[PDB]
């Protein structure tokens, strides 16, 4: 009939998190496969995030919005569909503030929007120009851009006077999912490398020291040409934050024709 | 095919019942191996709490529900009476010996063939232990390395009406320290009586396993399947030390196995680093009777449990 | 799943013969009281409710049309005796079921059926020879 | 709830596990086919009250009419029935020879598989004994009444005793399969079959060939088939022993019945 | 945490399902390997009967209940069209590769590390064929027994943990000489240990004698296979055993 | 209550055969061990044929006769007792000629007593 | 060896045993083979392969030797391996097995009463 209150926001989180947990391992060159059982017994072992969710029929409205946004992302941009859903799900998976602490969504949305403006400001600093004769601006992939941006917010949050500092830092740690999944697929220790990875961005330059998706160990992005475009990451973080801000603003799912 | 008021397991499933019990008892005690291993509690029911890592106490004082597993507990009692150490490692090797044997028994191999391989692997493993043992003179600098290696496995890496460091405040803490001292004294006793000592941290198990694999059959062609099972069983000790320390089980064992040179080289598991580590250099030394009795105790029980064909009720 | 019969009902051995011996006695009981001139009558009703009263053994068997396999053997044998002679169907029906009843306990004791056939074929010819002589 | 059925992954067909002896089950389907016709064997064969598909009653003892009316659905039995249909080609008799003999080969094969002998080694023995039987049959028209079945069994049993290896087990059982035919004639005549085999082997031990079972209810002794005029055809026994062995070997070579779909 | 009309195995049970299917399909086709192997019947339902040991007919024409096993059935259709042989042994190696991989995956090893060991052993395995289409190679599992000893005497060059995947590839190739001993009625362990123990100071081949069970030099008896069959076998088994191990989750697309 | 008919001989065979199947593997120098679950949850891993049957409870009187005859063997000869029960169980395990062939036991017993005089002479 | 040696004597002697008693008379001979059947099963060697060759040795070679080695599993002569057992133990072992089997076969009604 109708669902309102914290039950709505807690349900949209479990929906978007469930859709993200499916395609966590389909990221990077070591994209793990997924076995989709058709009703007639047919099976396809594809590993494309778009085709997986395209064929999976879902009932929750929040999960449909998370899927339809990635579809729209696929047309405007031919890459970053899997990262939008993982980040949007990880940004929503931090329910410590919504229920245990009883923070209103308007407080978190003020923090998510503040982080988005700062996340964009941090990418353009670590950018690098392009000699296209041989937007011309790339960024260091392999988790370097995520861990680099997370270091800026963690330092920027120290001067963030208010209760919004707690969800502001949580968005930073949520960006660590990208090197987390890349390390998990390689089979290496996730905590050991991610711990040493965060330390490199603190002392050494943030424009490098990412993750090797083929080897599993740490490596600089200047030595390995995994440089991604800038517009793909901006629309990826902008779409993930705007999608997380969307579902948090949903507090009453009601019927009506 | 049975009388009333009784039961009988005719087929080979009776052997699987004993293999499952040892596998379960293996997973219980593997978490309390070494200093970084966890502790187990002994609730007497009356209201007395007791924490300890000594495998002899976790098998003698702790009553075991499974009938088959209580047999291995009696051996840990016998193991503690001779050397006073190695009861935990004894059960882990028994659990892995029977585990590796099931892989070949499922392929139609008889148990008696595997046990004959253990007897061959034991003699080869027993001869290699004579070469690795260090017969140096026992000095205060050496016994401290033995006492530290024995006491670290029973305390919090720090050691009525006085604090625990006044050598305690509680009753069970005094009993825990009493057991560690008796295990520490017996460890220094064995090193002094038996002047030979052997490296620890699984360096002997890794070296003996490499020797067994580099050993062609000499008693029977199919006996080498048991020798291979005996080799893989010895590697459970460094595997468990990597688990309790929180490191990868496979990365640790592969690194120490890759260490090869044209000289005597025995590496072990560094619990703080995870990398290889010469146990003789850093000051980790085990007794010669402990590793010697393990091969004699592990083979005999793993053999006898494999020779069990049927499980009958004697009026149960 | 994969069975041999799959609806094919079949039984063999001594239980099948004993089942046919008992089924043949049912046909005897239907015409046991009609033996002789003063025999008891039998009332038979068709599907339309029309009644039929008659003490003739041949007329009774025609109206029954029993579906049992062993019973059809006696009925077709008795019917042939009616067409050829028109009398003696009850004597043939009673003697057949009585030959089967007397050898019933011997069949249960493990006596082979073929040994029983040699006795009837032998005792019959001796009886037919005794009739013509006397 | 686990553990469910083992070795069941093809359309949920009844796949007998290693303990359930899938080979032992296809043999039981063939043994039941013999019992339906083992009693109709010989001059004293028992008739069958067959009920036609038109609900018609027929009492007969012919093997071809029994199987034509008995809808044999088990494929393992269809192979032996196909041998009976192949028996009708090149000869018009010996149908129950295929059913009784093949049923004894498979029934006796279980005694070998239960010991542990491989099915591939059992087949090599029957193929060797079938080739050996074709060499002995000219030395024997041939006598009937189970006379050839004991002599051919006696000659094949001696070949297996002196032949070392594992093939002797299946070669000896190939000889005992021939004994099922005199046992069928004796059982259908009301005689202890073991006494017929004991006497038929004694007279053959003394060299009195051409001696068969004396068909009589009150006389379990034996007589000469030549003097009585009882004689069988050579090609009837040749093609029957050949097709029966191929049907038995073809069933032994099969170890699992699997469904399909076009 | 799930939607209605949806199911997914997030843990490693997806591998235990796919690994169990390959083991089941392994036990089915292993009985029809070689001449001593038994035959399989193909009942079309309408009454037709067809006997055949060819693995492609037992996978193309027959119907399989498990969805995962139907994937491997399509592989045999590809293996048949390129070489024309090796469809049965292709399924045995996949089952034994996945069997040995499950032994190490239970110890906490990632699947992707095992696939890197197969790619290294496969490249070394192909080079061994060139040392031992006008070219032919021996049979009777002589190449598998030889390649197994060759891969054991070969260390990685990318990482150390790939040593485990090479060991799984070595013990997986031995299923062929193991199965040939089973179908011939000989002990699985005695036959393999004899041919594997046979060594000399020269290039020597050795295989399973199906009639005697003792070792046998395939060249001295006239037992030869094709080069493209063994070449496509290593490339086919490695690709499918790899892809089956990379399956992290099984999701129902509205089944 | 009681037993009568063919069920007795086939039942005595399964009882004697079952007692022999227990100690089939307890023969020779490479004898196999046996696990005896005590009522208190304990285990005895003995491999002695006399000790195993001594501790096992038997309901059939035929098993008591097989066990009691083995004890008489131990008093006279402390060796070969395990061979008695195995042979007695194998000689009885051939139930084909016993019941399926409908031979009388007197026919079987006359053959077993004839072979015994021949087995003694050959040894 | 004594079991297989005795079994060959009965099987060769049963050829002249005219009657139905030859079948159980030969079955006793096959029952003696169980003794090496268990010795071979414990060692792990193939039972059918060795027991088949074991019976062939008694046919051709002398029956006083060529038994079974329980430790190794292969065949060996008892003149080369001192596994010689007494006669009184085997005769009493053979009589007690037949006398016991004859006893239980003579039972046809398990009756209760005192
Ligand atoms: N060669 C590589 N090494 C390491 N990481 C890579 C490599 N190629 C791509 N990636 C990572 O995979 C992620 C997804 O890349 P891509 O497939 O282009 O987008 P999408 O997965 O959305 O289609 C990127 O964030 C990038 O960091
Ligand atoms: N400091 C250490 N570093 C590495 N390994 C150790 C250290 N101390 C003990 N071990 C290992 O732990 C194992 C068990 O030691 P201990 O606790 O004395 O015996 P138990 O576990 O049987 O009581 C030994 O085999 C030894 O190799
Ligand atoms: N009068 C007889 N006496 C003894 N044996 C006979 C007699 N008639 C037939 N037989 C035996 O019965 C067997 C089957 O004969 P027949 O009925 O002609 O073939 P089928 O049973 O295949 O139809 C033959 O092998 C023959 O030896
Ligand atoms: N006569 C033989 N002796 C030994 N091995 C054989 C013999 N015939 C076939 N094989 C082995 O059986 C395997 C499978 O052969 P084949 O049946 O042709 O392919 P598939 O089993 O894929 O249909 C081959 O690898 C070959 O080595
Ligand atoms: N070393 C051996 N090799 C072969 N057979 C043996 C050996 N030792 C004993 N046996 C056999 O085991 C059987 C039982 O011997 P033993 O244990 O002395 O008697 P029991 O089993 O009655 O106690 C004997 O019949 C003997 O033939």
């Amino acid at each position: 009939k109708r669902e309102s209150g914290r039950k709505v926001q807690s349900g949209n989180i479990n929906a978007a998190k469930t859709i993200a947990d499916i395609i966590r391992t389909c990221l990077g060159p070591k994209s793990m496969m997924k076995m989709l059982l058709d009703p007639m017994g047919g099976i396809v072992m594809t590993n494309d995030g778009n085709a997986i969710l395209r064929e999976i029929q879902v009932q929750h409205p929040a999960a449909k919005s998370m899927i339809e946004i990635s579809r729209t992302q696929d047309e405007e941009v031919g890459d970053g569909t899997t990262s939008v859903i993982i980040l949007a799900g990880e940004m929503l998976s931090v329910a410590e503030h919504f229920l245990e602490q009883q923070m209103h969504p308007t407080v978190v949305i003020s923090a998510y929007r503040k982080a988005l403006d700062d996340m964009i400001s941090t990418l353009k600093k670590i950018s690098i120009p392009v000699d296209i004769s041989d937007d011309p601006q790339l960024v260091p992939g392999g988790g370097a851009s995520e861990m680099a941006v997370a270091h800026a917010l963690t330092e920027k949050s120290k001067a963030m006077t208010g209760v919004e500092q707690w969800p502001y830092r949580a968005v930073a740690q949520a960006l660590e999912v990208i090197p987390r999944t890349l390390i998990q697929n390689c089979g290496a220790s996730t905590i050991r490398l991610l711990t040493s990875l965060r330390a490199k961005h603190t002392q050494e330059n943030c424009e490098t020291w990412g993750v090797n998706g083929e080897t599993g160990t740490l490596v600089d992005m200047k030595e390995l040409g995994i440089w991604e475009p800038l517009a793909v990451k901006l629309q990826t973080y902008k779409t993930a934050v705007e999608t997380a801000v969307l579902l948090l603003r949903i507090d009453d799912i009601v019927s009506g024709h | 095919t049975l009388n009333p008021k009784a039961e009988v397991a005719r087929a080979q499933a009776a052997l699987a019942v004993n293999i499952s019990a040892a596998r379960g008892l293996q997973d219980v005690l593997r978490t309390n191996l070494g200093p970084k291993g966890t502790m187990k509690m002994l609730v007497s029911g009356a209201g007395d709490i007791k924490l300890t890592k000594d495998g002899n106490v976790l098998l003698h004082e702790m009553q075991i529900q499974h009938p088959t597993a209580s047999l291995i507990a009696k051996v840990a009692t016998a193991q503690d009476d001779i050397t006073g150490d190695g009861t935990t490692s004894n059960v882990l090797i028994i659990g892995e010996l029977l585990k590796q044997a099931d892989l070949y028994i499922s392929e139609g191999l008889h148990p008696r063939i595997i046990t004959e391989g253990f007897e061959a692997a034991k003699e080869k493993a027993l001869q290699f232990l004579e070469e690795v043992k260090v017969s140096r003179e026992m000095d205060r600098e050496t016994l401290i390395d033995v006492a530290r290696t024995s006491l670290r496995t029973k305390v919090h890496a720090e050691l009525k009406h006085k604090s625990e460091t006044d050598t305690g405040p509680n009753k069970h803490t005094l009993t825990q320290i009493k057991d560690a001292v008796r295990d520490g004294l017996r460890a220094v006793k064995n090193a002094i009586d038996d002047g030979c000592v052997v490296p620890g941290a699984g360096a002997v198990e890794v070296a003996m396993a490499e020797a067994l694999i580099k050993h062609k059959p000499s008693v029977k062609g199919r006996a080498q399947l048991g020798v291979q099972a005996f080799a893989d069983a010895l590697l459970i000790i460094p595997k468990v030390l990597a688990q309790n320390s929180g490191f990868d089980l496979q990365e640790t064992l592969v690194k120490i196995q890759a260490e090869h040179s044209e000289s005597g080289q025995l590496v072990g598991v560094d619990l703080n680093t995870g990398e290889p580590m010469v146990a003789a250099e850093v000051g980790v030394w085990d007794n010669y009777c402990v590793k010697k009795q393990l091969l004699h105790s592990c083979t005999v029980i793993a053999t006898n449990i494999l020779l069990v064909d049927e499980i009958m009720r004697a009026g149960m | 799943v994969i069975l041999l019969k799959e609806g094919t009902d079949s039984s063999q051995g001594i239980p099948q013969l004993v089942s046919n011996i008992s089924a043949c006695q049912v046909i005897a009981e239907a015409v046991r009281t009609t033996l002789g001139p003063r025999g008891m009558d039998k009332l038979i009703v068709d599907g339309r409710g029309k009644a039929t009263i008659s003490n003739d053994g041949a007329t009774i068997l025609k109206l029954l049309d029993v579906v049992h396999p062993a019973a059809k053997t006696l009925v077709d044998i008795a019917k042939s005796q009616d067409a050829e002679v028109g009398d003696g169907t009850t004597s043939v029906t009673l003697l057949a079921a009585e030959f089967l009843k007397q050898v019933k306990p011997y069949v249960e004791e493990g006596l082979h059926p073929q040994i029983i056939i040699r006795a009837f074929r032998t005792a019959t010819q001796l009886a037919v020879n005794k009739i013509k002589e006397i | 709830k686990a553990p469910g059925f083992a070795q069941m992954l093809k359309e949920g067909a009844k796949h007998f596990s290693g303990l359930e002896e899938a080979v032992y089950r296809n043999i039981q389907a063939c043994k039941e086919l013999a019992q339906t016709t083992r009693t109709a064997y010989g001059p004293n064969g028992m008739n069958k009250m067959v009920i036609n598909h038109l609900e018609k009653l027929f009492v007969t003892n012919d093997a071809a009419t029994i199987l034509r009316e008995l809808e044999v659905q088990h494929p393992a039995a269809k192979m032996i029935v196909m041998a009976s249909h192949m028996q009708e080609q090149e000869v018009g008799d010996g149908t129950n020879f295929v059913l009784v003999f093949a049923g004894a080969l498979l029934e006796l094969a279980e005694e070998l598989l239960r010991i542990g002998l491989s099915v591939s080694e059992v087949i090599e023995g029957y193929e060797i004994a079938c080739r050996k039987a074709h060499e002995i049959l000219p030395n024997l028209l041939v006598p009937g009444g189970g006379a050839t079945e004991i002599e051919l069994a006696k000659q094949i049993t001696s070949y297996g005793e002196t032949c070392p290896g594992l093939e002797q087990y299946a070669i000896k059982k190939f000889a005992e399969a021939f004994e099922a035919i005199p046992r069928a004639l004796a059982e259908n005549s009301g005689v202890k079959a073991n006494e017929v085999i004991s006497k038929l082997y004694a007279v053959h031990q003394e060299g009195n060939k051409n001696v068969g079972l004396d068909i009589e209810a009150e006389v379990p002794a034996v007589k000469d088939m030549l003097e009585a005029g009882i004689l069988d055809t050579y090609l009837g026994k040749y093609w029957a022993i050949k097709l029966a062995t191929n049907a038995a070997v073809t069933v032994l070579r099969v170890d699992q019945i699997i469904m399909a779909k076009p």
Side-chain angles (χ1 to χ4, degrees), chain A, chain B, chain C, chain D:
Chain A
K1 179 170 163 180
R2 59 183 289 266
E3 318 306 332
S4 192
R6 64 194 178 285
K7 192 194 169 187
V8 174
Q9 288 147 20
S10 161
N12 300 337
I13 290 158
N14 301 339
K17 187 174 176 292
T18 295
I19 299 296
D21 291 325
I22 289 159
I23 59 172
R24 263 183 210 281
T25 56
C26 297
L27 194 83
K30 307 303 210 190
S31 316
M32 300 283 269
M33 294 190 177
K34 308 292 175 168
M35 199 189 282
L36 307 174
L37 303 175
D38 301 341
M40 291 195 70
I43 285 158
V44 192
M45 303 186 295
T46 190
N47 56 355
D48 189 5
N50 300 343
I52 289 156
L53 308 176
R54 187 179 70 199
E55 304 298 338
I56 288 154
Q57 178 56 27
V58 293
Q59 307 302 335
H60 211 288
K64 291 176 181 174
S65 298
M66 193 69 256
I67 291 155
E68 291 289 355
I69 288 159
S70 76
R71 188 180 56 71
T72 297
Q73 188 67 12
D74 181 67
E75 308 301 335
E76 182 62 18
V77 192
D79 200 359
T81 61
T82 297
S83 294
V84 164
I85 289 151
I86 291 158
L87 296 166
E90 196 71 9
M91 283 169 178
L92 294 165
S93 88
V94 186
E96 191 178 1
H97 309 302
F98 303 154
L99 293 151
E100 195 84 359
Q101 302 295 317
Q102 304 292 329
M103 293 277 105
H104 204 261
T106 51
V107 171
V108 169
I109 290 155
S110 291
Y112 278 32
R113 288 192 183 287
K114 280 167 182 167
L116 173 54
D117 301 334
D118 297 334
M119 285 145 69
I120 292 159
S121 179
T122 302
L123 294 161
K124 299 174 178 174
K125 293 177 185 180
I126 56 166
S127 67
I128 192 172
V130 192
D131 187 8
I132 66 193
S133 289
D134 182 17
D135 200 341
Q137 289 184 355
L138 303 169
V139 287
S145 59
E146 280 75 351
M147 299 293 291
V149 167
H151 170 64
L153 312 188
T154 297
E155 293 288 353
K156 184 66 175 294
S157 74
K158 291 181 179 176
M160 189 64 65
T161 303
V163 74
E164 293 175 357
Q165 66 189 243
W166 303 111
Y168 187 87
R169 295 169 190 168
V171 172
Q173 298 177 11
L175 302 177
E176 306 189 354
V177 66
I178 298 297
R180 194 190 292 157
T181 56
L182 292 168
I183 293 159
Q184 192 184 354
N185 296 347
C186 285
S189 178
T190 310
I191 294 149
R192 191 182 61 182
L193 295 170
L194 193 69
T195 297
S196 303
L197 177 56
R198 203 188 298 93
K200 291 280 185 186
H201 282 260
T202 297
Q203 298 169 2
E204 275 277 90
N205 198 338
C206 295
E207 194 175 350
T208 66
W209 294 114
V211 175
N212 200 332
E214 294 181 5
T215 307
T217 50
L218 315 182
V219 72
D220 283 305
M221 295 291 108
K222 287 171 181 166
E223 302 175 0
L224 200 68
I226 320 304
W227 297 85
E228 306 203 330
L230 187 71
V232 176
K233 284 287 195 179
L234 294 168
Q235 299 184 18
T236 292
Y237 296 125
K238 181 166 162 287
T239 316
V241 168
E242 283 180 357
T243 299
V245 164
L246 184 64
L247 306 181
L248 290 160
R249 281 177 73 73
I250 307 306
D251 57 343
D252 191 30
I253 285 154
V254 196
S255 57
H257 201 51
Chain B
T1 69
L2 59 87
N3 311 269
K5 315 189 184 167
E7 189 173 358
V8 68
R10 294 278 157 186
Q12 56 259 32
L15 177 56
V17 167
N18 300 339
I19 290 156
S20 188
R23 276 187 187 168
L25 193 67
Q26 179 176 1
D27 300 1
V28 167
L29 300 172
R30 63 179 191 75
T31 65
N32 56 53
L33 187 72
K36 309 301 186 194
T38 60
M39 301 181 80
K40 303 290 185 181
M41 191 187 286
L42 197 152
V43 181
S44 64
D48 303 326
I49 313 309
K50 189 184 175 175
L51 307 176
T52 189
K53 303 183 186 176
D54 203 60
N56 179 83
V57 175
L58 306 176
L59 296 169
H60 186 93
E61 295 189 8
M62 299 192 167
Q63 316 311 328
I64 289 154
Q65 196 180 358
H66 207 289
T68 299
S70 57
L71 273 163
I72 294 157
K74 284 183 185 169
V75 169
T77 319
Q79 183 91 355
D80 214 41
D81 300 332
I82 306 305
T83 53
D85 200 23
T87 60
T88 306
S89 61
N90 195 344
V91 174
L92 301 174
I93 289 158
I94 288 158
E96 203 72 1
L97 280 169
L98 304 173
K99 181 178 163 185
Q100 295 289 319
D102 181 30
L103 294 165
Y104 300 116
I105 284 157
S106 288
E107 299 181 2
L109 181 57
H110 203 249
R112 176 61 70 171
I113 289 150
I114 290 157
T115 61
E116 288 173 2
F118 297 165
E119 200 72 6
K122 187 171 76 176
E123 199 71 9
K124 174 55 168 191
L126 194 73
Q127 288 167 16
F128 191 78
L129 191 69
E130 211 76 357
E131 293 179 356
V132 169
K133 84 195 182 161
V134 179
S135 64
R136 68 195 298 188
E137 187 173 5
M138 291 289 108
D139 50 325
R140 199 216 174 72
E141 297 168 1
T142 298
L143 306 178
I144 285 161
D145 293 352
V146 169
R148 280 191 197 288
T149 296
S150 171
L151 288 159
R152 42 155 145 88
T153 69
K154 307 289 170 67
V155 305
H156 313 266
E158 278 282 9
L159 317 184
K160 313 192 182 178
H161 316 289
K162 294 294 296 197
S163 59
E164 56 262 24
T165 64
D166 290 292
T167 301
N170 314 319
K171 189 176 170 180
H172 64 265
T173 299
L174 300 153
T175 309
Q176 183 177 344
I177 292 153
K178 181 167 178 179
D179 303 358
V181 168
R182 290 190 301 169
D183 280 88
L185 293 160
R186 276 188 296 193
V188 173
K189 185 192 172 292
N190 299 336
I192 287 158
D193 294 340
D194 313 277
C196 311
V197 285
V198 303
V204 170
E205 277 72 356
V206 170
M208 288 194 308
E210 192 181 344
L212 297 170
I213 290 156
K214 295 180 184 175
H215 196 50
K216 310 304 193 181
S218 276
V219 73
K220 183 169 161 35
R222 279 186 295 169
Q224 64 186 291
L225 305 176
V227 174
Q228 186 64 18
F230 200 97
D232 296 298
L234 295 167
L235 307 180
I236 196 72
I237 303 300
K239 279 178 180 196
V240 167
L241 295 166
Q243 283 190 343
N244 302 335
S245 54
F247 292 96
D248 193 86
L249 178 140
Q250 305 295 350
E251 301 182 16
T252 294
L253 178 57
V254 168
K255 289 163 182 172
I256 64 182
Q257 276 171 3
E259 293 290 350
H260 300 286
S261 56
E262 190 48 287
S263 53
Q265 199 175 12
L266 298 164
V267 286
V269 178
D270 198 346
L271 313 190
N272 310 308
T273 316
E275 296 289 353
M277 186 184 69
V278 184
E281 292 282 5
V282 293
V284 175
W285 301 86
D286 292 334
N287 306 327
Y288 174 76
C289 57
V290 166
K291 302 295 191 185
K292 177 165 179 182
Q293 198 70 15
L294 271 166
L295 306 174
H296 287 202
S297 187
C298 291
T299 294
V300 166
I301 305 304
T303 291
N304 295 351
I305 296 290
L306 283 164
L307 302 170
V308 165
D309 186 67
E310 288 177 356
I311 293 154
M312 284 158 271
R313 292 184 180 283
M316 189 170 182
Chain C
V1 174
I2 308 303
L3 310 183
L4 196 143
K5 301 163 273 149
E6 200 71 4
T8 317
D9 266 10
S10 315
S11 190
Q12 60 191 320
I14 288 149
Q16 186 59 227
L17 173 50
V18 167
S19 182
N20 296 341
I21 291 162
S22 297
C24 278
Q25 292 171 1
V26 166
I27 301 301
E29 206 78 355
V31 304
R32 191 171 57 73
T33 44
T34 76
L35 190 71
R38 296 173 62 193
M40 306 191 81
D41 313 308
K42 297 282 175 176
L43 176 59
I44 292 152
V45 176
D46 69 329
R48 306 174 298 179
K50 308 298 192 175
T52 294
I53 292 157
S54 42
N55 66 328
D56 188 62
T59 307
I60 291 156
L61 301 168
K62 291 176 173 185
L63 302 168
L64 289 170
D65 310 317
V66 171
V67 306
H68 199 289
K72 284 186 182 188
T73 298
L74 290 173
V75 170
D76 308 327
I77 290 280
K79 279 175 175 175
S80 70
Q81 192 71 9
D82 176 69
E84 293 172 3
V85 176
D87 208 348
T89 60
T90 314
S91 179
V92 169
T93 294
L94 285 175
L95 282 166
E98 197 71 0
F99 298 142
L100 290 167
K101 186 180 171 181
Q102 294 287 326
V103 307
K104 190 176 177 294
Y106 298 120
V107 163
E108 294 178 352
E109 290 288 355
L111 184 63
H112 202 248
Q114 205 75 16
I115 289 153
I116 288 153
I117 287 158
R118 302 291 297 287
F120 300 160
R121 299 287 187 190
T122 294
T124 297
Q125 198 70 35
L126 298 164
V128 169
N129 294 340
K130 186 63 169 184
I131 289 158
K132 297 170 186 170
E133 289 171 7
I134 197 69
Chain D
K1 188 171 167 182
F5 307 122
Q7 205 211 64
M8 264 185 73
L9 298 171
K10 300 205 172 186
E11 292 289 355
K14 174 53 173 191
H15 290 178
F16 296 91
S17 200
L19 302 165
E20 282 189 345
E21 304 180 14
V23 175
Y24 178 85
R25 307 294 177 174
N26 287 345
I27 294 164
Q28 193 70 31
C30 305
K31 293 199 295 188
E32 291 172 358
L33 192 72
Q35 301 294 327
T36 312
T37 60
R38 187 181 173 198
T39 60
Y41 193 87
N44 296 344
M46 294 285 281
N47 303 324
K48 305 287 173 167
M49 197 170 290
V50 175
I51 293 153
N52 207 299
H53 64 269
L54 309 172
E55 301 181 14
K56 291 184 184 183
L57 197 75
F58 297 118
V59 178
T60 190
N61 48 344
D62 176 71
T65 318
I66 290 155
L67 307 174
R68 276 179 187 182
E69 294 291 346
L70 196 145
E71 297 289 352
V72 173
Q73 300 297 339
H74 207 297
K78 283 186 173 188
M79 292 159 177
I80 289 155
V81 168
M82 277 192 294
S84 167
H85 297 348
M86 279 293 295
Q87 189 69 26
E88 288 172 1
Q89 316 312 282
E90 309 295 344
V91 59
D93 220 336
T95 289
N96 286 326
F97 202 107
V98 177
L99 313 179
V100 172
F101 189 58
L105 295 171
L106 303 171
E107 181 168 8
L108 292 167
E110 298 170 327
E111 302 188 359
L112 305 175
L113 303 174
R114 284 276 179 72
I115 289 157
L117 193 70
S118 182
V119 76
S120 303
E121 292 167 7
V122 166
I123 290 152
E124 288 174 357
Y126 290 179
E127 288 183 1
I128 287 160
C130 175
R131 293 161 193 166
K132 178 51 56 171
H134 291 179
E135 295 178 5
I136 292 150
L137 196 66
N139 307 333
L140 302 171
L141 304 163
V142 306
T148 47
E149 313 311 327
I150 302 300
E151 299 183 37
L152 200 64
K154 188 175 184 72
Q155 293 288 352
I156 289 162
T157 300
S158 191
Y159 174 73
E161 188 66 18
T162 69
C163 179
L166 302 176
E167 55 259 32
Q168 66 188 324
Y169 293 104
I171 288 157
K172 286 171 177 174
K173 297 285 179 180
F174 198 90
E176 300 186 7
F178 288 115
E179 293 177 1
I181 279 151
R183 285 162 181 285
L185 301 165
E187 286 169 5
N188 303 345
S189 298
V191 173
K192 298 184 187 178
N194 292 325
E195 293 290 349
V196 172
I197 305 303
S198 175
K199 293 180 192 301
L200 286 169
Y201 268 111
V203 305
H204 291 133
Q205 181 58 24
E206 302 191 357
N208 306 326
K209 301 183 175 191
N210 318 311
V211 172
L213 174 52
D214 187 10
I215 300 298
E216 189 66 16
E218 60 245 42
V219 179
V222 285
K223 62 178 186 180
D224 200 313
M225 296 277 109
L226 179 61
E227 295 172 7
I230 294 147
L231 298 169
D232 295 346
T233 312
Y234 175 83
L235 284 159
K237 302 287 188 177
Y238 176 85
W239 284 94
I241 292 157
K242 185 171 183 173
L243 295 166
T245 311
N246 301 347
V249 163
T250 296
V251 166
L252 290 165
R253 283 185 195 289
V254 172
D255 58 349
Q256 198 187 20
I257 293 151
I258 291 153
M259 291 154 62
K261 191 164 66 177

